[PDB]
Structure formats: C-alpha cells, structure tokens
C-alpha cells in the first residue's frame, strides 16, 4: 500500500450546466468546441461561466 489522502482526489467543479435548457446546451456545445480547438483562453472562461449557477452569474446593471 501507498500512503496518500484520498479526500481531495475528486475536484468539485461544474463540468456541465445543471440546467436542462436546450438553448444553453446548444451554445455550450458551440463553446465547448471553440475552447477545445482554439488556444484562446477567452473561450475557456466563457465556457466555464456557462456552466455556472444563476447566483454565480449575477445580473449586470446597465450603468
């Protein structure tokens, strides 16, 4: 046996939206391809934000 702590093995993060919105699923598909097949880190940030919950996407005031 090898000594290691297995409590931190599973990283807790969104891998997909918890919503069943098919329109959010569709552009998640679109931005999953872009992040994978481009070196842009902008698409990576946008893709991970599409996964995020509503409280983690607060409304942006116009001002």
């Amino acid at each position: 046996g090898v000594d290691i702590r297995h409590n931190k093995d599973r990283k807790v993060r969104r891998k997909e939206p918890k919503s069943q919105d098919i329109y959010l699923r569709l552009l998640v598909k679109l931005y999953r391809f872009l992040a994978r097949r481009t070196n842009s880190t902008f698409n990576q940030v946008v893709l991970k934000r599409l996964f995020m919950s509503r409280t983690n996407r607060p409304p942006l005031s116009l001002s």
Binding site: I22, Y23, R25, L26, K29
Partner: protein, 125 residues
C-alpha cells in the same frame, strides 16, 4: 433546426425503443435504426432511406426534397429500383455520391439495400 429538434427528441420520442442495454429508433427513414443525430430520419433538412418494395421484389429509396420542408405531404420523393443486386447498389451509390446528397449515409444505405435484397431472395432448402 436539426440540432434544436434533436435536443427535444433525443430522449423523449414516440419512435424511441429503450430496452435491455440498447436503444433504437423506429422512424421511417432511419437507416441502421439507431437513436443518433446522424441517422435520425426526421430532424434533418435532407434525409435518405431505403425500404422494401410494396411487392415482394425491389428496394424503394426515398429522398427528402428541400422546398416543402414544412409540408410533409410532398416532402419525400421515392423511386423503386428493381434490377440485379449489383445494379441497385451502384444506382443508390450514384444517388448519394454524385448528388452529394448526405454522403455520410452512403454505406449505411448500400448496406441496408443489401440486407433488404437478400431478405427478398428465396430461402433455400
């Protein structure tokens, strides 16, 4: 749109058969009869499919036209091919490859045409 309509019927459809560790789709123009975006016979702007002839001999290949995508009465054209096994296979190959009409179902259509054709051939003793 095919991708939008797919997300509606990918798990909730009348043609969906979910059984022991398998899934199938029973819509008319689904070659290989599998629940898939590629092979779904309803959501696509153009679709191809082959069926056994109304009689005991021949293969009917049905091609979806583009003008009446909303009108289902005239949305499909069907032709009956009743020649030898090699001739029909080449004819349906030309009907896909040369027209550039969905050239990803070419071998799915030829394989299905072969399975239908030998099903029509009589059983030997």
């Amino acid at each position: 749109s095919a991708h939008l309509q797919w997300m509606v019927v990918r798990n909730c459809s009348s043609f969906l058969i979910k059984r022991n560790k398998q899934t199938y789709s029973t819509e008319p123009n689904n070659l290989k009869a599998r629940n898939s975006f590629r092979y779904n016979g309803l959501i696509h702007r153009k679709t191809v499919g082959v069926e056994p002839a109304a009689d005991g001999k021949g293969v009917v290949v049905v091609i979806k036209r583009r003008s009446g995508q909303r009108k289902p009465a005239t949305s499909y054209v069907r032709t009956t091919i009743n020649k030898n096994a090699r001739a029909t296979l080449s004819s349906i190959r030309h009907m896909i490859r040369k027209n550039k009409y969905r050239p990803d179902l070419r071998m799915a259509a030829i394989r299905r045409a072969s399975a239908i054709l030998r099903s029509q051939k009589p059983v030997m003793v």
